[PDB]
Amino acid sequence: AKKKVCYYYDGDIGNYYYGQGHPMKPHRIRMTHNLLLNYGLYRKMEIYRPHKATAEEMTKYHSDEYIKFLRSIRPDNMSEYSKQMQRFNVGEDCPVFDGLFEFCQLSTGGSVAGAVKLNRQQTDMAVNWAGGLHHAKKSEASGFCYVNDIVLAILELLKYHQRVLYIDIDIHHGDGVEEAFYTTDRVMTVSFHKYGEYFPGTGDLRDIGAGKGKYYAVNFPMRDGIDDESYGQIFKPIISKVMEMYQPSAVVLQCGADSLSGDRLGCFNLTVKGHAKCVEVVKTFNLPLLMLGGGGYTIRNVARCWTYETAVALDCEIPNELPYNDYFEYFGPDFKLHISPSNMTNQNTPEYMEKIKQRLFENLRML
Ligand SMILES: Nc1ccc(-c2ccccc2)cc1NC(=O)c1ccccc1
Ligand SMILES: [Ca+2]
Ligand code: NA
Ligand SMILES: [Zn+2]
């Protein structure tokens, strides 16, 4: 039926700034929030402000040294930490900015808080659009991500769930999450991503897990230009089979929006409806569900996508005509919720889509 939804947001989020020209704009989370509030969606869900996750919380996965560094590093003391910066991959893609650690605390706090809420059976779904930082590693920043809120949330869920399923529709491979759980069967990770001379360079379909986790990592490598139809042909069959074989008791869905048509950094051709179809599919399994954000660099479309996916989680139909909001000018020239795909070529033939699906199905028979 209709599900109870708890939603995590801290209004301070939009004030963090990666620096001039950096494509990651935390402000997109405020835009998303402002938009969904103007559609009246606050009426249907509980809105929480997450706590700032502590170093204790973060060191449930990350090394004490990496976290102490993140707590210490500031733009005013960078010159002293030059070695440590290189060791932990900070100062380029992953810059030092004012309030960096607090920004990690806020985005992490939402995922961990949502996981606790699900564990206590006090919601059916928890939403943290500030989370989904899938590239962060035990002792290293990567791809704009510093602290892996997702691995932390999953570790929380594993306190009460024998098997947790992770699904990642970000255009990039979820390497940090896959890496953390690569050798366990208690977390199956499923990533659909662009593959071939593309960040982070991992997620070959032959990467299937190791030891006890062998066959519990599933990767669907894709080419430029994938569209709603190609994606839809593959997503539901794969997830259904995964659900059948794996029988998870909780699910974490990363909804990274850099897989949308027109993304500044991505090269997929999905609409908001195509992207959201993935949320609908996962929803129908009626399992405790943590939905997280992720990448997304054309910020008007990120706001539309996550607003609509919040509406999907709520089974709440919203008009295509955008309500007035604080960021109304970002949504021109159309001022509509939904987007059109571009005319870019889909390098993913139907045959390629079916062949990869078939290989993945063979692996799933091994469960
Ligand atoms: N993939 C991803 C997911 C979440 C965050 C993220 C989400 C919230 C806060 C911080 C990072 C950042 C990324 N990084 C990229 O998308 C990317 C793009 C180009 C090159 C390298 C990486
Ligand atoms: Ca992905
Ligand atoms: Na695993
Ligand atoms: Zn991404």
XYZ file of C-alpha atoms and ligand atoms in Angstrom:
392
model
C 0.000 0.000 0.000
C 1.074 3.624 0.687
C 4.273 3.841 2.693
C 5.444 5.916 5.627
C 8.294 8.227 4.488
C 10.807 10.001 6.729
C 12.908 12.645 4.969
C 16.221 14.138 6.222
C 17.363 17.690 5.455
C 19.555 20.292 7.048
C 19.104 23.808 5.609
C 22.808 24.580 6.283
C 23.717 22.123 3.478
C 23.244 24.634 0.648
C 25.901 26.891 2.186
C 28.919 24.602 1.623
C 31.042 25.605 -1.345
C 33.594 23.405 -3.149
C 35.258 26.463 -4.786
C 35.170 28.415 -8.065
C 34.454 26.223 -11.083
C 33.935 23.006 -9.037
C 30.917 21.162 -10.516
C 29.658 19.810 -7.140
C 27.143 22.320 -5.788
C 25.585 21.430 -2.382
C 23.088 24.216 -3.133
C 21.248 21.636 -5.355
C 19.952 19.963 -2.171
C 18.354 23.225 -1.005
C 16.820 23.681 -4.506
C 15.412 20.148 -4.301
C 13.984 20.828 -0.845
C 12.516 24.189 -1.779
C 10.874 22.727 -4.851
C 9.260 19.757 -3.088
C 8.003 22.024 -0.254
C 6.321 24.215 -2.880
C 4.566 21.165 -4.361
C 3.176 20.658 -0.785
C 4.910 17.268 -0.277
C 5.798 18.174 3.347
C 2.147 17.428 4.094
C 2.617 13.703 3.364
C 5.918 12.930 5.098
C 7.849 13.467 8.305
C 10.689 15.916 7.851
C 13.750 15.460 10.134
C 16.910 17.439 10.585
C 19.763 14.902 10.917
C 22.379 15.073 13.660
C 25.994 15.770 12.819
C 27.570 12.277 12.637
C 30.556 11.981 14.996
C 34.060 10.559 14.405
C 32.939 7.489 16.400
C 30.168 7.002 13.854
C 32.475 7.531 10.873
C 35.251 5.239 12.154
C 32.788 2.325 12.051
C 34.231 2.135 8.504
C 36.877 4.805 7.975
C 40.373 4.699 9.533
C 41.029 6.767 12.666
C 43.875 8.557 10.776
C 41.715 9.533 7.771
C 38.950 10.883 10.016
C 41.382 12.778 12.293
C 42.770 14.373 9.103
C 39.315 15.387 7.844
C 38.547 16.927 11.294
C 41.817 18.900 11.207
C 42.330 20.084 7.617
C 41.346 23.709 6.831
C 42.155 26.138 3.958
C 44.272 28.154 6.430
C 46.462 25.136 7.410
C 46.719 23.292 4.047
C 50.368 24.269 3.551
C 51.303 22.237 6.653
C 49.437 19.054 5.656
C 50.714 18.740 2.058
C 51.833 15.103 2.512
C 48.680 13.992 4.306
C 46.596 15.710 1.618
C 48.259 13.576 -1.069
C 47.963 10.376 0.993
C 44.181 10.856 1.505
C 43.508 12.238 -2.011
C 42.348 15.680 -0.905
C 43.112 19.014 -2.596
C 42.087 18.535 -6.239
C 38.791 16.785 -7.244
C 38.186 16.672 -3.474
C 39.251 20.106 -2.262
C 39.665 21.574 1.177
C 36.886 24.067 1.794
C 35.486 25.906 4.822
C 33.300 23.580 6.901
C 34.374 20.460 4.981
C 34.065 18.223 8.093
C 30.631 19.633 9.077
C 29.482 19.028 5.478
C 30.607 15.353 5.867
C 28.810 15.196 9.226
C 25.516 16.521 7.766
C 25.409 14.274 4.713
C 26.434 11.223 6.779
C 24.000 12.014 9.665
C 20.988 11.721 7.324
C 21.899 8.250 6.023
C 22.751 6.802 9.420
C 19.643 8.427 11.006
C 17.459 6.989 8.210
C 18.982 3.516 8.733
C 18.190 3.647 12.484
C 14.644 4.756 11.742
C 14.217 1.756 9.384
C 15.828 -0.655 11.904
C 13.363 0.463 14.588
C 10.516 -0.169 12.095
C 9.318 3.405 12.529
C 9.169 4.204 8.770
C 8.905 2.203 5.530
C 11.213 4.540 3.618
C 13.914 7.012 4.628
C 15.191 9.659 2.244
C 18.528 11.484 2.398
C 19.210 13.432 -0.783
C 22.431 14.881 0.658
C 23.876 11.376 0.906
C 24.930 8.692 -1.559
C 28.658 9.498 -1.521
C 29.574 6.152 -3.092
C 33.229 6.774 -4.056
C 34.707 7.415 -0.573
C 37.123 4.711 0.570
C 38.233 3.500 3.979
C 41.217 5.875 4.010
C 40.782 8.066 0.994
C 38.578 10.743 -0.546
C 37.521 10.190 -4.144
C 35.348 11.757 -6.883
C 34.097 14.669 -4.727
C 33.188 12.257 -1.829
C 34.979 12.235 1.555
C 32.940 10.079 3.923
C 30.975 7.068 2.681
C 27.580 7.633 4.263
C 26.255 4.625 2.332
C 28.678 2.056 3.829
C 27.967 3.582 7.248
C 24.171 3.303 6.733
C 24.516 -0.306 5.528
C 26.658 -1.233 8.559
C 23.796 0.183 10.656
C 21.201 -1.897 8.785
C 23.297 -5.065 9.205
C 22.740 -4.804 12.967
C 19.181 -6.020 12.306
C 19.167 -7.417 8.749
C 20.991 -10.560 7.708
C 21.067 -9.537 4.001
C 21.085 -5.929 2.688
C 20.733 -5.112 -1.012
C 22.458 -2.040 -2.480
C 21.398 -0.671 -5.909
C 23.180 2.267 -7.555
C 21.787 4.188 -10.609
C 24.371 6.967 -10.539
C 26.145 7.172 -13.926
C 29.361 6.218 -12.113
C 30.267 2.815 -10.676
C 29.679 2.600 -6.896
C 33.258 1.536 -6.228
C 33.526 2.542 -2.562
C 30.431 0.559 -1.580
C 31.368 -2.455 -3.703
C 34.891 -2.345 -2.232
C 33.690 -2.299 1.421
C 31.420 -5.338 0.905
C 33.276 -7.171 -1.851
C 34.062 -10.165 0.354
C 30.769 -10.620 2.179
C 27.468 -12.211 1.234
C 25.601 -10.027 3.762
C 25.552 -7.173 1.213
C 24.938 -7.643 -2.458
C 25.889 -4.569 -4.477
C 24.294 -3.893 -7.883
C 25.621 -1.025 -10.029
C 24.541 0.152 -13.477
C 27.079 2.665 -14.863
C 28.947 3.981 -17.870
C 32.068 1.921 -18.373
C 35.099 2.445 -20.655
C 37.698 5.188 -20.066
C 35.399 6.767 -17.489
C 35.619 7.592 -13.788
C 36.393 5.621 -11.606
C 37.578 2.948 -14.098
C 36.009 0.030 -12.191
C 32.789 -2.035 -12.491
C 33.608 -4.490 -15.306
C 30.816 -7.068 -15.488
C 33.503 -9.711 -14.700
C 33.932 -8.093 -11.245
C 31.640 -10.397 -9.265
C 32.945 -10.369 -5.674
C 35.502 -12.526 -3.846
C 35.615 -15.194 -1.108
C 32.220 -15.375 0.631
C 31.102 -12.378 -1.473
C 31.796 -14.073 -4.824
C 28.619 -13.644 -6.941
C 27.363 -10.930 -4.542
C 28.704 -8.014 -6.646
C 26.790 -7.352 -9.865
C 27.954 -4.762 -12.401
C 26.122 -3.660 -15.558
C 28.615 -1.692 -17.765
C 26.949 0.668 -20.278
C 27.964 2.989 -23.121
C 27.125 6.655 -23.829
C 23.588 7.705 -24.598
C 21.471 5.102 -22.858
C 17.781 6.057 -22.955
C 14.604 5.380 -20.916
C 13.682 2.385 -23.074
C 17.089 0.659 -23.022
C 17.367 1.153 -19.270
C 13.806 0.041 -18.575
C 14.328 -3.142 -20.643
C 17.078 -4.195 -18.188
C 16.471 -2.669 -14.781
C 13.259 -4.449 -13.710
C 14.331 -7.959 -14.936
C 17.723 -7.644 -13.168
C 16.262 -6.315 -9.939
C 13.463 -8.932 -9.946
C 15.967 -11.746 -10.374
C 18.233 -10.286 -7.705
C 15.246 -10.020 -5.322
C 14.280 -13.675 -6.055
C 17.739 -15.139 -5.546
C 19.098 -12.870 -2.801
C 15.986 -12.280 -0.662
C 17.289 -9.186 1.127
C 15.423 -7.812 4.120
C 16.480 -4.196 3.526
C 17.427 -2.174 0.436
C 19.575 0.919 -0.098
C 18.984 2.747 -3.394
C 21.507 5.389 -4.550
C 19.665 7.704 -6.981
C 22.637 9.678 -8.322
C 21.171 12.111 -10.892
C 24.224 12.365 -13.173
C 22.651 9.611 -15.277
C 20.059 12.153 -16.568
C 19.982 13.629 -20.022
C 21.952 16.900 -20.201
C 24.074 16.327 -17.127
C 27.131 18.577 -17.180
C 29.509 15.638 -16.545
C 27.448 12.585 -17.538
C 26.703 11.138 -20.960
C 23.474 9.191 -20.454
C 20.131 10.246 -21.987
C 17.580 9.349 -19.278
C 14.563 11.497 -18.436
C 13.325 12.090 -14.889
C 10.523 9.593 -15.609
C 13.010 6.959 -16.791
C 15.204 7.512 -13.728
C 12.214 7.489 -11.390
C 10.922 4.237 -12.899
C 13.851 2.642 -11.017
C 12.450 3.943 -7.717
C 8.960 2.649 -8.608
C 10.403 -0.805 -9.383
C 12.350 -1.084 -6.115
C 9.343 0.234 -4.154
C 7.073 -2.578 -5.346
C 9.096 -5.140 -3.343
C 7.724 -3.640 -0.120
C 11.018 -3.829 1.774
C 12.513 -1.254 4.184
C 14.096 1.214 1.791
C 16.777 3.890 2.222
C 16.863 6.220 -0.783
C 19.968 8.412 -1.153
C 21.190 11.116 -3.562
C 24.550 11.052 -5.373
C 26.040 12.824 -8.385
C 24.195 15.352 -10.550
C 25.744 18.496 -12.049
C 22.971 20.193 -14.062
C 21.303 21.389 -10.884
C 17.879 22.292 -12.206
C 17.454 18.683 -13.383
C 18.793 17.267 -10.088
C 16.085 19.279 -8.282
C 13.352 18.002 -10.623
C 14.564 14.415 -10.412
C 14.703 14.143 -6.634
C 11.492 16.140 -6.165
C 9.647 13.734 -8.498
C 11.270 10.700 -6.804
C 10.116 12.017 -3.428
C 6.611 12.258 -4.995
C 7.040 8.676 -6.258
C 8.032 7.425 -2.761
C 4.836 9.070 -1.479
C 2.654 7.689 -4.321
C 1.705 11.303 -4.829
C 0.902 12.617 -8.322
C 2.238 16.160 -8.909
C 1.565 18.490 -11.866
C 4.131 18.971 -14.584
C 3.660 22.751 -14.240
C 6.241 23.918 -11.680
C 4.950 25.800 -8.627
C 6.611 29.119 -7.877
C 9.699 28.597 -5.608
C 12.896 30.432 -4.521
C 14.796 29.098 -7.536
C 12.071 29.451 -10.148
C 14.448 31.115 -12.694
C 16.723 28.027 -12.765
C 13.910 26.039 -14.407
C 13.451 28.138 -17.546
C 12.779 28.341 -20.342
C 9.991 25.749 -19.850
C 9.271 25.808 -16.070
C 8.061 22.197 -16.228
C 8.980 19.279 -13.941
C 9.704 16.715 -16.649
C 12.562 16.760 -19.152
C 13.094 15.730 -22.790
C 15.923 13.480 -23.883
C 18.493 14.892 -26.282
C 19.089 13.574 -29.833
C 22.416 11.967 -28.802
C 23.144 8.532 -30.155
C 22.494 5.554 -27.928
C 25.723 3.487 -28.208
C 23.912 0.694 -26.300
C 22.263 -1.535 -28.867
C 19.284 -3.658 -27.716
C 21.447 -6.736 -28.442
C 24.201 -5.426 -26.152
C 21.620 -4.747 -23.415
C 20.192 -8.289 -23.653
C 23.602 -9.944 -23.834
C 24.932 -8.268 -20.679
C 21.636 -9.074 -18.873
C 22.029 -12.687 -19.924
C 25.599 -12.891 -18.583
C 24.463 -11.344 -15.289
C 21.596 -13.842 -15.046
C 24.179 -16.692 -15.370
C 26.056 -15.307 -12.361
C 22.871 -14.994 -10.348
C 22.178 -18.744 -10.912
C 25.237 -19.363 -8.775
C 23.554 -17.940 -5.648
N 29.443 9.830 -8.533
C 29.251 10.670 -7.414
C 28.240 10.389 -6.490
C 28.043 11.217 -5.395
C 28.844 12.351 -5.189
C 28.620 13.264 -4.026
C 27.313 13.505 -3.537
C 27.088 14.379 -2.476
C 28.166 15.033 -1.889
C 29.459 14.813 -2.371
C 29.695 13.938 -3.430
C 29.844 12.653 -6.136
C 30.039 11.818 -7.230
N 31.087 12.080 -8.131
C 30.874 12.200 -9.451
O 29.737 12.112 -9.882
C 32.066 12.435 -10.302
C 31.988 13.144 -11.511
C 33.139 13.338 -12.265
C 34.365 12.849 -11.828
C 34.443 12.161 -10.628
C 33.302 11.956 -9.872
Ca 25.978 3.291 -10.689
Na 29.183 -8.220 -1.168
Zn 28.309 10.062 -10.323
